[PDB]
Design a protein around this ligand. Structure first.
Ligand SMILES: Cc1nc2ccccc2nc1-c1cc2nc(N3CC[C@@H](F)C3)cc(N(C)C3CCOCC3)n2n1
Ligand SMILES: [Mg+2]
Ligand SMILES: [Zn+2]
Length: 312
């Protein structure tokens, strides 16, 4: 049968946590299939259904600056690297579920936070009172899975199918950064008091949640030019949201105000110290081979410090 392959530089570098999927959009589907085949197997999905699923997922991402198809694939590659470095800790269903979850986790994102949907009074905020966009992303995932010839899970049993959709729902809900803080605090305590148990389903759930945050934030773990240029796409969205907050007569948070451009370097420090570093720290304690993500994050924090000190 038909192994997907990649050019040599990509074949080698795709295995590393810091890999950038590149600017050639038409190669991103092949990169994902390559990752499913190596992390899951050539037998995991019917190639034809998988190809049709990927192309419908792509079409349901919007041309926004950051929360786009390139983010989806980027977040899947970080998951792939985690799974390939922790081969024997994950069930076959988890391998299957989590790459699809990462590809789908921001489906039909519009470039706005949960908070802006609530203040605009968007219909999605009446349908889903918390984790508004994330419940929408899971709903879009199930919609696409139910299109004719798109059910990539059709060969599982009733209960394996319910389990995989449950892995995907939880993984996608965990990408709500509002739930990250409390999830990591709990994982921290469970690990330090030695009560963390990967046979306890509700513990595994928490560990997958943290893996989803880690993959979602993985732009902070890249080569500095990738990090810094991705930061520009993130702020293009934040600042548009700020603009839309001012049109509703609401002063945006500093993060989203384009008048406070000059503070970006310091806001990045806040984010690395409050979110990213503690995320990759706890992840590294639970899964030692993910340590390269913590080290790259620490390297990028020190590049932001250099931007403040005027050395870059
Ligand atoms: C939320 C995010 N997500 C990323 C994901 C990937 C890559 C970079 C990412 N950066 C950010 C990000 C950007 C940013 N800019 C800030 N300021 C304040 C005014 C001006 F100086 C820029 C302040 C913050 N906070 C301190 C956040 C602390 C954690 O909860 C949300 C608030 N953040 N966080
Ligand atoms: Mg999201
Ligand atoms: Zn995301």
């Amino acid at each position: 049968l038909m192994q997907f392959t990649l050019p040599v530089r990509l074949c080698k570098e795709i295995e590393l946590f810091h890999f950038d999927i590149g600017p050639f959009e038409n190669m991103w589907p092949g990169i994902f299939v390559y990752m499913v085949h190596r992390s899951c197997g050539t037998s995991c999905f019917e190639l034809e259904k998988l190809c049709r699923f990927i192309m419908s997922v792509k079409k349901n991402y919007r041309r926004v600056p950051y929360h786009n198809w390139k983010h989806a694939v980027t977040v899947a590659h970080c998951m792939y690297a985690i799974l390939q470095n922790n081969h024997t800790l994950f069930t076959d269903l988890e391998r299957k579920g989590l790459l699809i979850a990462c590809l789908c986790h921001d489906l039909d994102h519009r470039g706005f936070s949960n908070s802006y949907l609530q203040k605009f009074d968007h219909p999605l905020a009446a349908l889903y009172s918390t984790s508004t966009m994330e419940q929408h992303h899971f709903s879009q995932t199930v919609s696409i899975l139910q299109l004719e010839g798109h059910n990539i899970f059709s060969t599982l049993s009733s209960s394996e199918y319910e389990q995989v959709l449950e892995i995907i729902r939880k993984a996608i809900i965990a990408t709500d950064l509002a739930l990250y803080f409390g999830n990591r605090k709990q994982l921290e305590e469970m690990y330090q008091t030695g009560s963390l148990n990967l046979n306890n389903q509700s513990h595994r759930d928490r560990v997958i949640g943290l893996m989803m945050t880690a993959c979602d934030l993985c732009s902070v773990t890249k080569l500095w030019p990738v990090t810094k240029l991705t930061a520009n796409d993130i702020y293009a969205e934040f600042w548009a949201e700020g603009d839309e907050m001012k049109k509703l007569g609401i002063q945006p948070i500093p993060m989203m105000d384009r008048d406070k451009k000059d503070e970006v370097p310091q806001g990045q420090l806040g984010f690395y110290n409050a979110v990213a570093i503690p995320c990759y720290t706890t992840l590294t304690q639970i899964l030692p081979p993910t340590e390269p993500l913590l080290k790259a994050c620490r390297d990028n924090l020190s590049q932001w410090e250099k931007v403040i000190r005027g050395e870059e």
